[PDB]
Amino acid sequence: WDEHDNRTRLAERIDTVNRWKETLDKCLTDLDAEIDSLAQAKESAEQNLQAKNL
């Protein structure tokens, strides 16, 4: 039964680690979306700047 107790501890540790994993995964996906949006914003601003000489 000491062996059984150790097994249970290991299982709960696994559960905690995996939930933290999925949290960071969703964070990374949101980060990617935001990066793309900021990119497009920057190029748009640049083309607006280019038009300022006529």
Binding site: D25, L28, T29, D32, A33, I35, D36, A39, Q40, K42, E43
Partner: protein, 84 residues
């Protein structure tokens, strides 16, 4: 309808990683370690893929030609024993 990593790479400014693709969708590869090989010993079992998960199994494509074993989980339609 396209992954944001793919969309980012199909843009002028260079921001993508120095790797093949995104990685959170991926797994053990991209420099994983701790490869567990089983030495064949007569006397002991030969358990493979010690990555035993516990996870969502579609019990759908399950035709083993001869699984006459203490196995074939869920339904079995089996007997218990005859003792002796």
């Amino acid at each position: 309808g396209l992954p944001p990593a793919y969309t980012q790479h199909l843009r002028e400014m260079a921001f993508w990683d120095p790797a093949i693709t995104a990685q959170y969708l991926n797994s053990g590869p991209r420099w994983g370690c701790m490869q567990w090989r089983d030495r064949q010993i007569r006397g002991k079992e030969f358990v493979v893929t010690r990555n035993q998960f516990g996870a969502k199994l579609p019990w759908r494509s399950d035709y083993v030609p001869l699984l006459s074993l203490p196995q074939r989980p869920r339904f079995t339609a089996q007997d218990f024993r005859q003792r002796g």
